[PDB]
């Protein structure tokens, strides 16, 4: 897909593009509190008043 | 300098009705000058500079600071879905021209939220809400249909609009929202199901094509797909509650405080 | 050893010894509070009544048990822990009150005894003590009194010249 | 009566109340003392009562009042029974038929509610009395009016409220965390009996648009909902 992609390449044209960018084949081309708490207390004082 | 500036924008806005668009945005750019002075001297300068700021927006990918200018020329529902209010100081003929500025807005404003808001506007006309339904509805066909009926308003200077570009512009970005709008959150999708709601989409194969375009576009996140089974995949928590949580006590305080 | 008071203790034993002085009789009532370590926390107060009977055979029994009853449908419940009374003379001039105190302390040997002064009290000077017997020896020594007040409380008390679960975990 | 004023020590007062009990949730209820003879209500004393609510009913000890009234009556014959407090911090549904109730200890009832959590520096009191403005043609509504307050000390008072203020110039509490912990071990179906009782209040609201009983309904439901947080 990825030759396709590129232009219907070679094997050979492709890996120089995975080799490019780093990409490599694996099974395929391999490519890739305590605030918290006190917050809730003011609101809770908030909507009580 | 008032007058100064209200040169540079007539001249800006001549140039663009037959001038390219960078310099036009550069003469925009220089030509804000303190409110004040337009505030005082009249009404409508005000307002014009408004429809020019929104036209740089328009010009601009961003829909914000057009949305902005706009709503200050004219009254615009605002964040929290307040009513914005403007004053009817300005003269008449004036006021018809803001009211063209109001409706040119719409078409940014659309794009800045939401949603179906057309209470200041006559309710009447089916030529702004009837255009409203369409996008609701998710269905091209309909959207299609608004434009070619209503051509004319597009047209209206032909040579200036001779292709109608900006709309149809404005309509392939408005198709895309509704698929977004699902926004995944499934974690694994049957593929039929994607398959029935982007064959609504115009090309059928699109979903192949279309699902992995969305997922450049990255408005929706797509997992597996291209897979061999060829089933899509689909603290920071704290945070959100803790906005909600303020929200709420912002809409008490402007209650206490009423 | 150490007393400590809460706001309300020392706001009704002033107020009760004062208004006992305008009567011209002695005010006595109990303290409510918690034996804490060797520490004693003095949490709330109440006034027994004037009564004919000087120092001991003062207190009324009905009265307290009745009192106590209804505070109890109240939050506090909190053990007597002692006793306070307004006596003006000084300085351990009387005899007398001690042994009411032999009378707590055989009720309950952590039982402390203050006393306050609502004459000689004045504005920068509360005269205050407290104290117990000892267990040609003297018979009796004092422990000084410290005030424990909560934030709640310190919040509430700067509106004169104004111009729960937190607790617990402590 | 233009307006109110409340002693230190009957603010600090409710507050201990208050804290004994240990209850967030919990609002605490009892008497007020004082002279409500003139124009200005003057607050100066108060006892806890025995309090309890059920649903939209509440029960307050009545030989309770009376028993210790008569005890505060030997102490002091100067300082009547002129109302209520509670904790609050706000009005409560059922507060003007409570209020109905002491209405005949004495009248016209005064309501002081005591923020005691002072969430507000500038008010730890708000006070209210009993009346309704009427409608032309139509039967009177009964509704609270707001009276100003201010806080006022004679002289005992304020010489032991700045002699506390100078400085600055457990097995009941592990009980309550044990109850905390065992409703955060049930909200589930506890949360969805407080959606059901937001969405009654909302209901409520809609009718009166009744009203006042929704409106509590769904202030209960977000009070639940502070209390399960604080216990997390």
């Not at chain 3, 027994?48 to 109240?74: I, K």
């Amino acid at each position: 897909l990825l030759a396709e992609m590129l232009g219907d390449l070679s094997d050979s044209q492709l890996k120089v593009w995975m080799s490019k960018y780093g990409w490599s084949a694996d099974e395929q081309i391999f490519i890739c509190x305590x605030x918290x708490x006190x917050x809730x207390x003011x609101x809770x004082x908030x909507x009580x008043x | 300098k008032m007058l100064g500036y209200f040169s540079l924008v007539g001249l800006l806005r001549l140039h663009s009705l037959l001038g390219d668009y960078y310099q036009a945005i550069k003469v925009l750019e220089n030509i804000e000058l303190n409110k004040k002075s337009m505030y005082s001297r009249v009404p409508e300068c005000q307002v014009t500079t408004y429809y020019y700021v929104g036209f740089a927006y328009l010009m601009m990918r961003r829909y914000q600071d057009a949305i902005r200018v706009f709503a200050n020329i004219l009254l615009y529902i605002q964040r929290t879905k307040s009513m914005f209010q403007r004053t009817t100081y300005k003269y008449e003929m004036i006021n018809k021209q803001n009211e063209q500025m109001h409706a040119l807005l719409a078409i940014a404003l659309t794009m800045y939220p939401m949603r179906i808001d057309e209470s200041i506007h006559l309710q009447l006309r089916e030529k702004y809400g009837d255009k409203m339904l369409r996008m609701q509805k998710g269905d091209p066909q309909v959207y299609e249909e608004l434009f070619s009926y209503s051509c004319p308003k597009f047209l209206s200077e032909p040579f200036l609009q001779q292709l109608k570009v900006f709309s149809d512009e404005v309509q392939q970005q408005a198709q895309l929202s509704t698929i977004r709008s699902f926004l995944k959150l499934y974690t694994t999708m049957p593929v039929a199901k994607l398959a029935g709601f982007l064959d609504l989409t115009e090309q059928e194969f699109r979903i192949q094509l279309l699902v992995f375009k969305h997922k450049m576009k990255n408005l929706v996140w797509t997992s597996g797909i291209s897979a061999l089974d060829g089933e899509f995949q689909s603290x920071x928590x704290x945070x959100x509650x803790x906005x909600x949580x303020x929200x709420x006590x912002x809409x008490x305080x402007x209650x206490x405080x009423x | 050893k150490q007393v400590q008071i809460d706001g309300l203790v020392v706001l009704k034993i002033i107020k009760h010894y004062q208004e006992e002085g305008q009567g011209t009789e002695v005010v006595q009532g109990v303290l409510l509070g918690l034996v804490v370590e060797d520490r004693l926390e003095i949490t709330n107060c109440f006034p027994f009544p004037q009564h004919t009977e000087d120092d001991a055979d003062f207190d009324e029994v009905q009265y307290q048990m009745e009192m106590m009853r209804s505070l109890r449908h109240v939050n506090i419940d909190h053990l007597h822990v002692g006793w306070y009374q307004s006596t003006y003379y000084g300085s351990f001039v009387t005899r007398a009150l001690l042994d009411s105190q032999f009378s707590y302390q055989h009720a309950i040997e952590e039982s402390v005894v203050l006393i306050y002064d609502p004459i000689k009290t004045a504005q920068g000077s509360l005269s205050l003590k407290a104290y117990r017997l000892t267990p040609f020896e003297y018979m009796f020594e004092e422990v000084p009194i410290v005030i424990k007040n909560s934030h709640l409380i310190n919040v509430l008390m700067w509106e004169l010249e104004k111009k729960x679960x937190x607790x617990x975990x402590x | 009566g233009r307006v109110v004023r409340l002693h230190p020590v009957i603010l600090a007062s409710i507050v201990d109340s208050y804290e004994r009990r240990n209850e967030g949730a919990a609002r605490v209820i009892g008497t007020l003392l004082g002279t409500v003879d003139k124009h200005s209500v003057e607050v100066t004393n108060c006892f806890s009562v025995p309090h309890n609510e059920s649903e939209d009913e509440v029960a307050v000890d009545m030989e309770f009042a009376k028993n210790m009234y008569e005890l505060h009556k030997k102490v002091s014959p100067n300082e009547l029974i002129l109302g209520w407090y509670a904790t609050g911090h706000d009005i409560t549904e059922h507060s003007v038929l409570i209020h109905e109730y002491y209405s005949r200890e004495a009248p016209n009832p005064i309501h002081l509610t005591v923020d005691t959590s002072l969430q507000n520096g500038r008010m730890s009191i708000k006070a209210y009395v009993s009346t309704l403005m009427g409608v032309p043609g139509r039967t009177m509504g009964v509704m609270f009016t707001p009276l100003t307050v201010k806080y006022a000390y004679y002289d005992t008072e304020r010489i032991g409220v700045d002699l506390i203020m100078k400085t600055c110039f457990x097995x009941x509490x592990x009980x309550x965390x044990x109850x905390x912990x065992x409703x955060x071990x049930x909200x589930x179906x506890x949360x969805x009996x407080x959606x059901x009782x937001x969405x009654x209040x909302x209901x409520x609201x809609x009718x009166x648009x009744x009203x006042x009983x929704x409106x509590x309904x769904x202030x209960x439901x977000x009070x639940x909902x502070x209390x399960x947080x604080x216990x997390x």
